[model samples]
Target: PVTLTLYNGQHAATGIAIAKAFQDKTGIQVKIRKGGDGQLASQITEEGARSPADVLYTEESPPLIRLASAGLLAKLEPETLALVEPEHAGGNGDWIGITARTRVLAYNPKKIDEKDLPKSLMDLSDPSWSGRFGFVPTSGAFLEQVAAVIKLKGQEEAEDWLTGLKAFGSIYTNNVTAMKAVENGEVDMALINNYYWYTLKKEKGELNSRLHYFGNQDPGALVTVSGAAVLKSSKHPREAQQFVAFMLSEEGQKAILSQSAEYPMRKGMQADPALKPFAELDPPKLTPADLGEASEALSLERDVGLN
Candidate 1:
């Protein structure tokens, strides 16, 4: 009857599936509290040592990074850290990675030739790309993407990129809508996470869109890691640690893959066969820790009227 509360910022089904499997295996029940990643992170930060959350599970690293930066996360069990590659774990061992998603350009072949696509994410800033591309700057993924841009280039350059996007890009509310815009020929392409294309094709019958991977360490090829962490304020640290540990176990990984198309973090785990090989991606060499909360990215977005 050991019950642990989870602040789940991942997809609801992902949290539910993992919780059910964990409970079945260990008899440790999980009580999930669902919300957007940033919302829950702010909640945990405000609650401090009195927060009821036992663990923080998120679809992106920023929320966990924010908590870890605030010194609110517990040191992960070494075994849990070992479940994924060392780099996927929080730089300070405060969180463990659960899965990952890559940024890709989803383009409609009918509107533009494959050879005509931009070679880098930065190329979208050019006037030639004006009104030809779509993006969701309001998304958490977009914020993280901007953070990667800032890390690789610099704040001034990141701001310029956002300003260009504001000027040239067709803004959408989310990746799905953006991709749909491309499909309907409203736009030639959309900047989105790679898995959304698979999810869309799975949900709908056919897609005119194809994903384009950036080469030469472009920010467009950035891989975002999803992570889970035990809260330092947890009254059930033992069971909470078990929760995060179970997320990387074979059974938990299966549950995660069943509900999501994201790449699994467990070493040697394989993603869907259709996905581009993770090793082949030319992402900027940056870790989740280097990305941090990316609060500045949002601020820049606001300054450039992207938000």
Candidate 2:
């Protein structure tokens, strides 16, 4: 009978389902603590070596990367690390991406004509597109995207994007709020997670439905990786490892994909039917390593007055 404390910063519905399934399958009692990603990262940092969390589940890569970089996470066993694609694993093999979300540009058709919409995220920075787009730099999702950009485009280009975003983009607190803002026609466009649009459409029974994917070799099409990891100070290492392995396995990945409407990282797992297939979109050639230092993301947010 293993007792695992799970520090979760994922959406409520998905977290609850994963907890229930893990407990039922392994008879392991999992205690889930919820918080926003930044708050959870603060909590873990505060807990330090005395932390009791056996597993940490995050909706983005930066926080997990931060934790791993801080040496707060235990080195995953070779076999457990091998379960996921190497590119999806943290450089230290301390974190594994369990699922992924693609970045997209959602738009309000009424506000901006379809033909007028920018083809990529970078295009929104142009003066003509200024003040027409919405963004959520304070959200972990956005930070992860920024982290990816910094990794792929280098500091100079990434810095320019941040500066452009600050000058032109309207900032929101979270993706849902940004989505609502776009729905209300408060802004013409937004950079958001793909599944969030679908989830919101399902919940609200209606949405703008005019969302356009910035695929075809654009940074906006980069996949935002989501993952889980076992903490070094965990009391139930074996069980935590089991949970991580299960998450990357066919059954666990399918459960999350079906229940959460998120894309699973497991090979051959189909994306949610309501959304586009993962393979159909020509996502950017970005990898987990490109996410770079999490601190760089925090610095960018603070510098841009988004903190």
Candidate 3:
């Protein structure tokens, strides 16, 4: 009969599945408030010591990083840390990773040969690619993509790429729309989260699409963690810890993969049948903590007028 309030900044199906499953199995009621990670994090920051959220669960690490850096998160159980790879557990164990998504290029194989694909994400802006690819900078995922580029490529180079992006690529409202355009031959290729293609393939079996990842340590090969944490101000610390543990447990991972089709962070866990293994994603060499706060990335996104 105990109810633990959660700020859920993840897909409804996945978040609700986790909550309901936990509620049923452990008799722990979860009251999840659905919203975007940025808004919820900001709300918690503004409320400070008066915040009512017992746990913060979200789609990416940046927002959680902000809270952790501000000393708003509680240290998690060490056993929870072992479930995920060490790096996926944030700095000093303030939060634990639940699942992951990686950035990729979606393309129609009929148009471009595998050998013809570009080597770097910045190559998307080459004049040869003009009118050939599409992207959505306005989407939260895409904003993080831009932010990662700014971090890896430097601001000046990032600006140059954005200039080329405006000139060469078609713009869309979101990643799904961008991939659909690629599927229908409007563009030969587009950049999207790798799992987006898996969803599209499952949704429309006839969709001819393949997701290409950046290799050789390409900046585009980011493996982003969707994480959960107990706020330091939580009144129900034990219940909050239990909720996070449930998210990392095997049954919880199955719930995540069965619903969201995302890669889970727990080693030896399986994802949706359609997804390749996490190691096969060939992610960039960055820790879950490495993403840190996205303040600089947001600043550059605005200064470049990408939003």
Q: Which tens-of-lDDT digit does each residue in 1-307 have in candidate 2?
A: 5778888888877777788788878898878899886688779889888888888888888788778888888888888787777898898899998888888888899898888878777777677878888888777778777776777677678788888888888888888888888888888888888877877777888677467877786778888788898988887788888988877877788767765667777766677677787876688887766765567877877877776
Model 1 segments more than 4 A misplaced = none
Clashing pairs in 1: none
Please list the residue runs of candidate 2 whose C-alpha ends up more than 4 Å from where it truly belongs after superposition: none
Comparing 1 and 2 by lDDT, which wins? 1
Q: Per-model C-alpha lDDT, please?
A: 0.89, 0.80, 0.83
TM-score for each candidate, following the candidate numbering: 0.94, 0.92, 0.91
Best by TM-score: 1
Q: How many pairs in model 1 have backbone atoms within 3 A of each other, for residues 3 or more apart or on separate chains, i.e. clashes?
A: 0
Better of 1 and 3 by TM-score: 1
Model 1, 1-307: lDDT tens digits are 6799999998888899999999999988889999988999999988877999999999899888888988999999998998898889888899988999889998999999999999899988889999999999878889999998888899999888888898899899988799889888899999998878887788886888888999678899899998999999999989999889999988899898877888899998888777788888878897887888888887788888777
Q: Is candidate 2 or candidate 3 better by TM-score?
A: 2
Regions of model 3 farther than 4 Å from truth: 110-115
Over 95-188, each residue of candidate 3 has an lDDT whose tens digit, in order, gives 8889988888888988887679888888977899988888887766676777677778888888888889888988888777898888887789
lDDT of 1 at 9: 92
Clashes of each: 0, 0, 0
* Model 2 clashing-pair count: 0
